[PDB]
Design a protein around this motif. Sequence first.
Motif, PDB file in Angstrom:
ATOM      1  N   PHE A 177      24.190  45.025  71.270  1.00 46.27           N
ATOM      2  CA  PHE A 177      23.567  46.336  71.298  1.00 46.27           C
ATOM      3  C   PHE A 177      24.548  47.501  71.312  1.00 46.27           C
ATOM      4  O   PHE A 177      24.167  48.637  71.586  1.00 46.27           O
ATOM      5  N   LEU A 178      25.801  47.229  70.986  1.00 43.91           N
ATOM      6  CA  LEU A 178      26.824  48.245  70.955  1.00 43.91           C
ATOM      7  C   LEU A 178      27.307  48.413  69.518  1.00 43.91           C
ATOM      8  O   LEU A 178      28.493  48.654  69.269  1.00 43.91           O
ATOM      9  N   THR A 179      26.372  48.307  68.578  1.00 42.50           N
ATOM     10  CA  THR A 179      26.690  48.303  67.164  1.00 42.50           C
ATOM     11  C   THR A 179      26.445  49.680  66.588  1.00 42.50           C
ATOM     12  O   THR A 179      25.465  50.342  66.950  1.00 42.50           O
ATOM     13  N   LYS A 180      27.330  50.101  65.683  1.00 40.60           N
ATOM     14  CA  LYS A 180      27.185  51.391  65.023  1.00 40.60           C
ATOM     15  C   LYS A 180      25.898  51.403  64.195  1.00 40.60           C
ATOM     16  O   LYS A 180      25.781  50.679  63.198  1.00 40.60           O
ATOM     17  N   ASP A 181      24.944  52.224  64.643  1.00 36.87           N
ATOM     18  CA  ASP A 181      23.606  52.326  64.059  1.00 36.87           C
ATOM     19  C   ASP A 181      22.861  50.996  64.166  1.00 36.87           C
ATOM     20  O   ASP A 181      22.855  50.181  63.236  1.00 36.87           O
ATOM     21  N   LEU A 182      22.261  50.798  65.338  1.00 42.34           N
ATOM     22  CA  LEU A 182      21.421  49.645  65.620  1.00 42.34           C
ATOM     23  C   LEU A 182      19.964  49.969  65.337  1.00 42.34           C
ATOM     24  O   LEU A 182      19.347  50.769  66.045  1.00 42.34           O
ATOM     25  N   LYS A 183      19.423  49.339  64.302  1.00 41.20           N
ATOM     26  CA  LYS A 183      18.000  49.381  64.018  1.00 41.20           C
ATOM     27  C   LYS A 183      17.493  47.964  64.104  1.00 41.20           C
ATOM     28  O   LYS A 183      18.168  47.049  63.626  1.00 41.20           O
ATOM     29  N   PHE A 184      16.316  47.772  64.700  1.00 41.57           N
ATOM     30  CA  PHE A 184      15.616  46.499  64.562  1.00 41.57           C
ATOM     31  C   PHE A 184      14.105  46.591  64.706  1.00 41.57           C
ATOM     32  O   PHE A 184      13.612  47.549  65.279  1.00 41.57           O
ATOM     33  N   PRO A 185      13.369  45.605  64.158  1.00 40.59           N
ATOM     34  CA  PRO A 185      11.924  45.521  64.299  1.00 40.59           C
ATOM     35  C   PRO A 185      11.502  44.729  65.507  1.00 40.59           C
ATOM     36  O   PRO A 185      12.343  44.130  66.171  1.00 40.59           O
ATOM     37  N   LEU A 186      10.195  44.693  65.750  1.00 43.93           N
ATOM     38  CA  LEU A 186       9.607  43.876  66.813  1.00 43.93           C
ATOM     39  C   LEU A 186       8.596  42.904  66.208  1.00 43.93           C
ATOM     40  O   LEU A 186       7.409  42.945  66.552  1.00 43.93           O
ATOM     41  N   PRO A 187       9.066  42.003  65.319  1.00 42.42           N
ATOM     42  CA  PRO A 187       8.118  41.210  64.551  1.00 42.42           C
ATOM     43  C   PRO A 187       7.222  40.366  65.436  1.00 42.42           C
ATOM     44  O   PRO A 187       7.656  39.880  66.484  1.00 42.42           O
ATOM     45  N   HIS A 188       5.981  40.214  64.990  1.00 38.71           N
ATOM     46  CA  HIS A 188       4.967  39.445  65.683  1.00 38.71           C
ATOM     47  C   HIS A 188       4.505  40.175  66.929  1.00 38.71           C
ATOM     48  O   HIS A 188       4.619  39.681  68.053  1.00 38.71           O
ATOM     49  N   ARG A 189       3.988  41.375  66.695  1.00 40.09           N
ATOM     50  CA  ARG A 189       3.318  42.155  67.723  1.00 40.09           C
ATOM     51  C   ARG A 189       1.985  41.524  68.087  1.00 40.09           C
ATOM     52  O   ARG A 189       1.309  40.966  67.233  1.00 40.09           O
ATOM     53  N   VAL A 190       1.611  41.635  69.356  1.00 47.07           N
ATOM     54  CA  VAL A 190       0.376  41.049  69.861  1.00 47.07           C
ATOM     55  C   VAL A 190      -0.392  42.040  70.735  1.00 47.07           C
ATOM     56  O   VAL A 190       0.190  42.750  71.558  1.00 47.07           O
ATOM     57  N   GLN A 191      -1.708  42.054  70.553  1.00 51.77           N
ATOM     58  CA  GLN A 191      -2.584  43.064  71.129  1.00 51.77           C
ATOM     59  C   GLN A 191      -3.346  42.456  72.310  1.00 51.77           C
ATOM     60  O   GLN A 191      -3.903  41.361  72.185  1.00 51.77           O
ATOM     61  N   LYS A 192      -3.382  43.158  73.443  1.00 49.92           N
ATOM     62  CA  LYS A 192      -4.157  42.719  74.611  1.00 49.92           C
ATOM     63  C   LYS A 192      -5.578  43.242  74.501  1.00 49.92           C
ATOM     64  O   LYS A 192      -5.864  44.359  74.944  1.00 49.92           O
ATOM     65  N   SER A 193      -6.471  42.456  73.904  1.00 49.25           N
ATOM     66  CA  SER A 193      -7.882  42.844  73.844  1.00 49.25           C
ATOM     67  C   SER A 193      -8.467  42.742  75.245  1.00 49.25           C
ATOM     68  O   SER A 193      -8.401  41.685  75.879  1.00 49.25           O
ATOM     69  N   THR A 194      -9.015  43.853  75.724  1.00 49.40           N
ATOM     70  CA  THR A 194      -9.645  43.907  77.040  1.00 49.40           C
ATOM     71  C   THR A 194     -10.904  43.039  77.087  1.00 49.40           C
ATOM     72  O   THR A 194     -11.224  42.452  78.122  1.00 49.40           O
ATOM     73  N   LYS A 195     -11.597  42.959  75.951  1.00 52.79           N
ATOM     74  CA  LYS A 195     -12.798  42.141  75.806  1.00 52.79           C
ATOM     75  C   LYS A 195     -12.437  40.659  75.663  1.00 52.79           C
ATOM     76  O   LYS A 195     -11.266  40.312  75.493  1.00 52.79           O
ATOM     77  N   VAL A 196     -13.451  39.794  75.716  1.00 52.03           N
ATOM     78  CA  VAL A 196     -13.269  38.357  75.462  1.00 52.03           C
ATOM     79  C   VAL A 196     -13.127  38.125  73.966  1.00 52.03           C
ATOM     80  O   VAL A 196     -12.113  37.613  73.502  1.00 52.03           O
ATOM     81  N   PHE A 197     -14.159  38.521  73.229  1.00 51.41           N
ATOM     82  CA  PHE A 197     -14.258  38.258  71.814  1.00 51.41           C
ATOM     83  C   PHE A 197     -13.756  39.427  71.021  1.00 51.41           C
ATOM     84  O   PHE A 197     -13.370  40.448  71.572  1.00 51.41           O
ATOM     85  N   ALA A 198     -13.742  39.246  69.713  1.00 44.02           N
ATOM     86  CA  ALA A 198     -13.448  40.310  68.763  1.00 44.02           C
ATOM     87  C   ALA A 198     -13.885  39.811  67.408  1.00 44.02           C
ATOM     88  O   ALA A 198     -14.065  38.604  67.218  1.00 44.02           O
ATOM     89  N   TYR A 199     -14.041  40.729  66.468  1.00 43.57           N
ATOM     90  CA  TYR A 199     -14.597  40.384  65.173  1.00 43.57           C
ATOM     91  C   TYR A 199     -13.622  40.624  64.041  1.00 43.57           C
ATOM     92  O   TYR A 199     -13.759  40.019  62.983  1.00 43.57           O
ATOM     93  N   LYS A 200     -12.625  41.480  64.256  1.00 43.31           N
ATOM     94  CA  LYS A 200     -11.781  41.934  63.157  1.00 43.31           C
ATOM     95  C   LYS A 200     -10.827  40.874  62.671  1.00 43.31           C
ATOM     96  O   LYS A 200     -10.369  40.979  61.537  1.00 43.31           O
ATOM     97  N   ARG A 201     -10.529  39.873  63.502  1.00 41.81           N
ATOM     98  CA  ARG A 201      -9.539  38.835  63.184  1.00 41.81           C
ATOM     99  C   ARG A 201      -8.135  39.405  63.238  1.00 41.81           C
ATOM    100  O   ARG A 201      -7.751  40.208  62.390  1.00 41.81           O
ATOM    101  N   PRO A 202      -7.332  38.924  64.178  1.00 39.00           N
ATOM    102  CA  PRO A 202      -6.225  39.731  64.630  1.00 39.00           C
ATOM    103  C   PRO A 202      -5.048  39.739  63.678  1.00 39.00           C
ATOM    104  O   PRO A 202      -4.971  38.933  62.749  1.00 39.00           O
ATOM    105  N   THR A 203      -4.132  40.655  63.951  1.00 38.49           N
ATOM    106  CA  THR A 203      -2.999  40.917  63.087  1.00 38.49           C
ATOM    107  C   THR A 203      -1.752  41.188  63.895  1.00 38.49           C
ATOM    108  O   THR A 203      -1.812  41.700  65.010  1.00 38.49           O
ATOM    109  N   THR A 204      -0.619  40.852  63.300  1.00 42.34           N
ATOM    110  CA  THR A 204       0.670  40.996  63.941  1.00 42.34           C
ATOM    111  C   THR A 204       1.545  41.970  63.164  1.00 42.34           C
ATOM    112  O   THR A 204       2.778  41.887  63.199  1.00 42.34           O
ATOM    113  N   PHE A 205       0.911  42.904  62.469  1.00 41.52           N
ATOM    114  CA  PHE A 205       1.652  43.822  61.644  1.00 41.52           C
ATOM    115  C   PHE A 205       2.255  44.856  62.578  1.00 41.52           C
ATOM    116  O   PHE A 205       1.671  45.206  63.609  1.00 41.52           O
ATOM    117  N   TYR A 206       3.430  45.337  62.200  1.00 46.61           N
ATOM    118  CA  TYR A 206       4.145  46.334  62.986  1.00 46.61           C
ATOM    119  C   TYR A 206       5.311  46.936  62.197  1.00 46.61           C
ATOM    120  O   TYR A 206       6.430  47.093  62.705  1.00 46.61           O
TER     121      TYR A 206
END
Length: 169
Positions: free
Chosen positions: A140-169
């Motif tokens: 983390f001491l690199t000249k211009d450090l950029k990175f992604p957070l691949p495989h994001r996950v959503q905490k659905s407050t509900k039990v079910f859901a209909y949209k069918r989840p996604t890990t886009f970010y």
Amino acid sequence: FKEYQVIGRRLPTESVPEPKLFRMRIFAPNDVVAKSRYWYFLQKLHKVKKASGEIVSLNVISEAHPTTVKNFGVWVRYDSRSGTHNMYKEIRDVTRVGAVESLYQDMAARHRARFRSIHILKVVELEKTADVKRQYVKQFLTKDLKFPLPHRVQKSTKVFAYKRPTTFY
RNA sequence: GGUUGCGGCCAUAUCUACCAGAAAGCACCGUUUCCCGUCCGAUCAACUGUAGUUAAGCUGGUAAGAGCCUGACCGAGUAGUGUAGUGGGUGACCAUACGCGAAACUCAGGUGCUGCAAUCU
């Protein structure tokens, strides 16, 4: 946690008043644990005990610049089942307290070493990169450090859901 | 201060080796008639304090002394340990928490003090 300063005298004897005083940067969760940990560390360096002695001053030391990311070198004497080791871990953290908190976890995870096993021998903000020996800081001491957070996950407050989840970010 | 008598604590007083001791006192020291005791007047007994002498005893001093004591944030807050845990550990044991806490070791200092009575340049 906090980083208590603890200062302690011993006591006054007739013949030798005004004793030498000592000081330790105890990383203790509170006034009371500070005062233990101080005496526990005293009793390993001098011939003084909480009875035959006294605390002078607790003062909670605060991080000078607590929103600056620092490369904290920490030396640790930790006691294994077998034998006791020294170490030198390095911790990218924004305070000493956070570092030394997050060391105790890192020791506990990687060496099952409990708080009661570990001594924090010295802690040091490292000024230069290069003095940062460990690769796992160096990342983390690199000249211009950029990175992604691949495989994001959503905490659905509900039990079910209909949209069918996604890990886009 | 020295010495003697009786002492107290019982080596800070013991021991080892080497030096010093004026005065008095101590002592060693001379003698075997008596009381006395021995194989042996050495010991003990008596007699003289006269013939002699500090040689020994006794006292004091010396020793990078042995010993002895006393102390120290010297070792060691170690070893051990009283209590606490649904702490660790296969266990053996260990770590912590509140407590108490050694001994060797290391260094430093010391090496009789003292009571009553009497006496002495």
